[PDB]
Amino acid sequence: SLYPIAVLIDELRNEDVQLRLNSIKKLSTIALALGVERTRSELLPFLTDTIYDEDEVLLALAEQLGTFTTLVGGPEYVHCLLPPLESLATVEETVVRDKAVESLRAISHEHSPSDLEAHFVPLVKRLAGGDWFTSRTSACGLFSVCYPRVSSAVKAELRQYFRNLCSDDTPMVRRAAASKLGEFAKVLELDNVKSEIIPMFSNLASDEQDSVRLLAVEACVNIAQLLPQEDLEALVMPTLRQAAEDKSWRVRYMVADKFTELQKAVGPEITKTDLVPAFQNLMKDCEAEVRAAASHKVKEFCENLSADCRENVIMSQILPCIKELVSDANQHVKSALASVIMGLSPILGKDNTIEHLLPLFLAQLKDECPEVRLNIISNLDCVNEVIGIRQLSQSLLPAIVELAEDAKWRVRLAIIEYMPLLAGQLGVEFFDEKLNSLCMAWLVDHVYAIREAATSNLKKLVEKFGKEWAHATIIPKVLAMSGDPNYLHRMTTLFCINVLSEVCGQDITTKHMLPTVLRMAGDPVANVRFNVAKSLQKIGPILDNSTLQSEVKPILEKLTQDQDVDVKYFAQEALTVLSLA
Amino acid sequence: KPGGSDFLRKRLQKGQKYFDSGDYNMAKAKMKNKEVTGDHIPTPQDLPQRKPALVASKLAG
Amino acid sequence: DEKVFTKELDQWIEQLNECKQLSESQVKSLCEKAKEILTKESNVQEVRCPVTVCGDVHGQFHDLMELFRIGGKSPDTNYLFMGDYVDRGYYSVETVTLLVALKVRYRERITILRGNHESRQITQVYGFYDECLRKYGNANVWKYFTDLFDYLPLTALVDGQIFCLHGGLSPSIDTLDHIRALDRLQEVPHEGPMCDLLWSDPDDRGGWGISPRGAGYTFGQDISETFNHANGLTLVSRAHQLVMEGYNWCHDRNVVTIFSAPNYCYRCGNQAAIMELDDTLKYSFLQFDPAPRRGEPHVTRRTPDYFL
Amino acid sequence: NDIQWCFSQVKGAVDDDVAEADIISTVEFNHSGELLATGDKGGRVVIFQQEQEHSRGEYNVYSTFQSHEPEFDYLKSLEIEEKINKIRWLPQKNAAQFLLSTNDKTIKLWKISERDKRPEGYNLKEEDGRYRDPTTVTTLRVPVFRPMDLMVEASPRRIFANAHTYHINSISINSDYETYLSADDLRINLWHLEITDRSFNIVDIKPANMEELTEVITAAEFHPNSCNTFVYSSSKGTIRLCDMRASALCDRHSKLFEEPRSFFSEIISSISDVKFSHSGRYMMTRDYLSVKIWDLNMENRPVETYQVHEYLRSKLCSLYENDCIFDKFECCWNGSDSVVMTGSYNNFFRMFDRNTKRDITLEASRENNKPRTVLKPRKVCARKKDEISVDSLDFNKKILHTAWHPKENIIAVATTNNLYIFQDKV
Ligand SMILES: [Fe+3]
Ligand SMILES: [Zn+2]
C-alpha cells in the first residue's frame, strides 16, 4: 500500500532527471499519503531549497507548489507554502521565476487580509529589498495581488517599495517594474496614479536603456485607459510623443506595434491632433521594421478614426504615405501593407476607391515579390463588397496566371490554396472561361505536392459550384488523364476520383467515375493497379450495394490474384473493408 | 607587401587537415563556371577520443 | 500472422514520417526482417520501370520529406535510392530507419542500394555512430544498422538499359557478370571491385586516375563508353558526387550523376534532383531546394522576437 | 608615485614539459574581483577565489572544469580546437556565479555554485545502497538536508553553437543584462542569454566573392554603459563604432577611427584587441607594436599613443620568419583608467601611466619567487650594465593575456603556462 509511495519519495533523490521529474509531478499523491500535518513539517522543508537545479525539474515543482493549499491544511496554513516558492522566485532561470511568481499570485488570494500583512507582504518586502536582482525582479509581479486587500498603512509601504524598484540600478529590475507598472496602476487609487505612477512612468520612459523605454509604451496604454480623457494631455501625451520620436528604433517599433491600442485609449480628439502626425512619421521611419509594423495598422487605425473626418484625413494624410510604401524597397514592408491596404475600400467608398486605391492595387499586383501579390489576391473580399470584382478581373487574371506558372512550386502551392476563394468571388462564368485551364494544368504538374493540392482544390470548387458544374466541366477532363502514358499522371485520376466522389454522390460516381476506375484495374503498372483497390475501398461506401456486388467485387477479386504482393494486399483489404468477403 | 587578400584567406583556412568532398566539388563548379582542401582522409583513430581523457590543469594543483 | 506485423509496421512508418525515432527493440526487429529480404536480392538488383532514381540524402530527413512531396509518397511512387542514407546529417537515424521501414513494408516498391557511407568505419567518422549513441545511449542501434548494410545490393539494373550504382565503374569490373560474382555480404573493402563501385567518380581526364577521395578510381569518358557498349547499357546513373544543379550529365551523356541532398551539409547551397523514369524508360529530372525549416534560419538577418 | 608592484603568487608547474594543452589562453577577473577565471588551450577552466579575510588576500583554487572538449565537425571535416579564446563573467544575479566560455566555434554559459546540503534519508534502502525488504514499509519518511563540506560545482547551463562559420575571436556582454555579441573573422552575432536556438547577425562584412577579401574583424566589444554602442576593429587598423539605435542592422558604422611605411605595415597595423575604458569615454586598441587610446569624440587621430617595443621594429624580418609577428597581444585598463597594461616578449609586460606619461617594464619570472618582493624595472637596449640585450630576448616567452583587478591594484599576468598575480606594495 505504502510501497508505491515510497518509490516516488526515493526518486526525489534519484540522479536521473526523468525519475526525479516524474516524482515531483506526483507530489500531490505523496502529500496525501503523508497527511496534512506531515506535509507541512516534513515534505515542504525538503522542497524549500532543492539541491538539484534542472530547469524542467524546478519548473515542474513551481507548478505543483501552487496547488497545495488544500494539502497543507487549507488557507489557515497556506503561508507554509511561501518559503518553497520564495526560493524558486530567486533562481537564475527566468521561466522558473515567472512560474514561481504565478504560483505566489495564485495562493495570495487564499491568504486572509491578516495573513497578507503578516506573511505575504513581508515576503514581498524581502524579495523587493533582496540583494540579488533575481529576487527583486520577481518582487515586481507580487505588488498587484496584495495591494487591494492590505490596509491603507501597508498600501503606503508597498508604493514606496515599488518606487524603489523602478529606480533600481539593474536594468533587469527596471524592465520588470516597467512590465508590471501597468497592472499595478489598475489597482491603485486614481489620486495615487496621477501623483505616484506618472513620475515613475515618466522616469522609465526616459531611461537610458532602450530595452526599458520600449516597455514604457505598453505601460502608457494601460495608464491612459485609467486617467480621465482631459488629463492625458498633461500626464500621458508628453511621454507618448517622445516615444514616437525616440532615437531608438526599438522604442518606435513598440509605438507602431501598439498604435491601435493607443488610439482606443487617447480617444478620437487626441488621435487627430497627435497620433495622426505620429503615424505618418512611423510610416516614413528609416527602419524597415518600424515601417512594416506601421503598415499592419493602416486598416485598423483608419477604421477607428472619428466619422466626422475619417474620409478627409485618410485621403489627405494617410493615403499619400501609403503611396510611398507601395514603392518601398523592403520586401516585408510591401507585404505587410498589401495584406491590409485593400481594407480601406469600404471607408473611402466606391468613387474614392477607384480614383485613389485602385492605382495602388494594380501596382501591388505587378510587384516582383510573390508574397505581395499573394497578399493582395487573398484579401479581395473587402473590395468586392464596395466595387464589383469584375472591374478587377482584367487585372487579377494576369497576376493569377503568372503565379500559377511560377518556377518555384511553393509559390504555385500558395495560389492553389486561394484558388477556391477567388473562384467564388469571380463566379462560375469567369472561372470556366479563364481559370479552368489553370486548374487542369496543375493536375499534371511535375511536383506531386502541386498535384495533391490541385486534387483537393477540385473538391472545394465542386462544393460551391455544385455537382452539375463538375459533371459538365471537371469530370470529363479528369478522366482524360487515365490514358496518360506516365503512371504518376494516371494515378492522379484515381486520386481525383477519391475526393470528387465524396461530393458528386451516386448519381455521378457510378455512371461516370466508376467505369474509369474499373477500366484502370488492367493498367500494366502495378502502382496504378493497387491504387484502384485503395480507390474502390474509399468510394465503395458511396456506391450502391447492388453495384458493389455486380462490378466492384469481381474486379477486386481479380486483383486478389495479381502477381504483385501490393495489389493482392490492398485488394484483400478492400474486400474486408467493403464486406465483400 | 607580405599581406594582401590571399594572406588573410589562408589564415581563415586554419589547418585544412582533412579532405572534404563538399568543398572539393563546390570548387570544381566555380572553376568550370570561370588550397581548396586537405589531402588526409579522416580516420576514426585520428578523431578525438570517444570520451574525455584529459587530467586536471596543473594550475589547480 | 503477417497482417498484425504489417499494421505495426505501418504505425512505424507514420511515426518516422513525423521524425520520431523508433525504440531500440523496434529497430532490432526491423533490421532482422530487412536482412531476410535483402539477402535474397542479387548484387545487380533488377528494377522494373517506372521508377524514380534518387541520390544521396545523408540523413537530411527534412529534405527526404521534401523529396517525397515532389516525387510522391511510397508506395504510390517507386523509388531507387543509390546509397548514402546516413552521416553528415542531423537525422541519420530517422532517415535510414524510414528507408529500411519502407523497404520491409514495400520491398517491391522501394529499392535501396549500398553507398560508401553504409560502412562501419566511415559511419564512426561522420556522425552516424555518434547520433545513434546520442539518441539511444548505446551502440546497439548502430550495430544493428551496420550489420544490415552488408546485405544492401551494390548496384541496380533498370530494364537492362540503365545501370544504377552509388559510385562508378571499376578497373576489375568489365561486365555485369563480374559484379554478380562479388561477395557483397561483408564490410566495404578499402581496395578491389567492391570498393571501386562505391568510391569511383567520373572525370574529364581520360582513362583511369587517382581518386582524391583516397579510395576508388577516377575514370574518364573512355571507360564509360566501353562499359556501356560491352553490357548494352543506354545510361549509367550514379551518385556520390556533389553537383550544384542536382543532376549533371558527363562523358557525352553516358553517365549522369544524381544528388538528392539539397544544400548539402546545410552549407553548400546546391540544388537536389531526382531522375524519374517513365513507363517507357524516358528520363526526366526534377530539381528542388531545401524545405523550409521551422524556426530557421538559425542565424537570421531579420530582427528576432527577443530583440524586437 | 610609481606603483611598486610586488610578487604575490605564481601558479602552475615550475619549468615543466609545457604541453600545448597547458598553455594559458585567457585571464578574466570577476566583476567584483573576488574570482579570477583562467582558460587554456586544453579547454580547461580554473577559477581562483581571493581569501575573504581594500583586500590583498591570496587567490586560491575555487573551481575547475572542462569547458570545451575536442570535436570533429563532420559537416566540414574540421577538427574544432578546444582552446578557450575568451572568458566573460556575467553580472552576479544570485548566490551562483555565471561566465561565458568560448572556443573557436561554441560559446557555453557555465554556472558555478556552492552546495553544502546533503539529502539524507531513504525508505527502500540505506545510504550505502543496501536495499531492504519492501514488505517492511510501515511508515513513510521524507529525506532531510544535512550540512556537508562546502563543494563548488560547475555545470553548463546553455550552449550557443552552430552560428559562426569562421573562428570566434571575441565575446562581449551588453549592459542591458540580456544580450551579448560574438564576433568571428567576418560576422558579428547578437545573442540573448536565455535563447540558444537563434541569433541575430548584426554585422556581416564577408565579400560576395572571397577573392576580394581585404580585411577581417579582429575584436569587438560593447560599450560598458551604453546599451546601443559597440566597436569592432579590423585587420586594417580601423575601428568602426556602431549605434544600434540607428537601425536593426549595424552594417553602417556611426563613426570610423583611423589614422592617415614599413614593408610589414599590412601586418603590424592589425589591431589585436580593443578595450573600452571603465568610464567608457576612452577606447584603447592594441596593434603589434603600439598601444593607441582613442577619444570617442575624436576620430581623425588617437589622443595618446604608446610604443610597446620599439626595439623590435628593426627585427620584423626575423619575427616574420618564426611567425611571432602574428601574435595577438592584449591590453587592459586599470580601475581608474589612469594606467594601461599590455604584454610583450621575454616575459615582459609594460605599464603606461596616462596621467604622468611614465613608462616602466616589468618581468614575470620565477627567479623573483618571493612574496612581497619589489619588481626591478627592466631596460632593453642594443649596452649598459643590467640592461637586457635585444638579441637575448626569448620570443617564445610571450605574455599575451593579462588582467587587472576591477578595483584594487592586483594584476594577473599569464605567461605561457604560469599565472602570476602581483599586488601593490601596501
Ligand atoms: Fe557517397
Ligand atoms: Zn555521399
Residue numbers in the entry:
A (entry chain A): 9 to 589
B (entry chain D): 42 to 75, 86 to 112
C (entry chain C): 2 to 309
D (entry chain B): 8 to 60, 66 to 272, 278 to 399, 403 to 446
Sentences from the paper on this structure:
To understand why MASTL-phosphorylated ARPP19 is only slowly dephosphorylated by PP2A:B55, we overlaid the structures of PP2A:B55–tpARPP19 via the PP2Ac subunit with the PPP subunit of both a PPP product complex (PP1 with a phosphate bound at the active site, PDB ID: 4MOV26) and a PPP pre-dephosphorylation complex (phosphorylated eIF2α trapped by the catalytically deficient PP1 D64A variant, PDB ID: 7NZM33). The thiophosphate and phosphate in the pre-dephosphorylation and product complexes overlap nearly perfectly. By contrast, the thiophosphoryl group of tpARPP19 is approximately 3 Å further away from both metal ions, in a position that is unproductive for dephosphorylation. This inhibitory conformation is stabilized by the interactions between the ARPP19 MASTL recognition residues (58KYFDSGDY65) with B55 and PP2Ac and the ARPP19 crossover (86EVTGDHIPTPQDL98), which is secured in place by the interaction of the ARPP19 C terminus at B55 site 3.
Inhibition of PP2A:B55 is achieved by the intrinsically disordered proteins ARPP195,6 and FAM122A7. Here, we report the single-particle cryo-electron microscopy structures of PP2A:B55 bound to phosphorylated ARPP19 and FAM122A. Consistent with our complementary NMR spectroscopy studies, both intrinsically disordered proteins bind PP2A:B55, but do so in highly distinct manners, leveraging multiple distinct binding sites on B55.
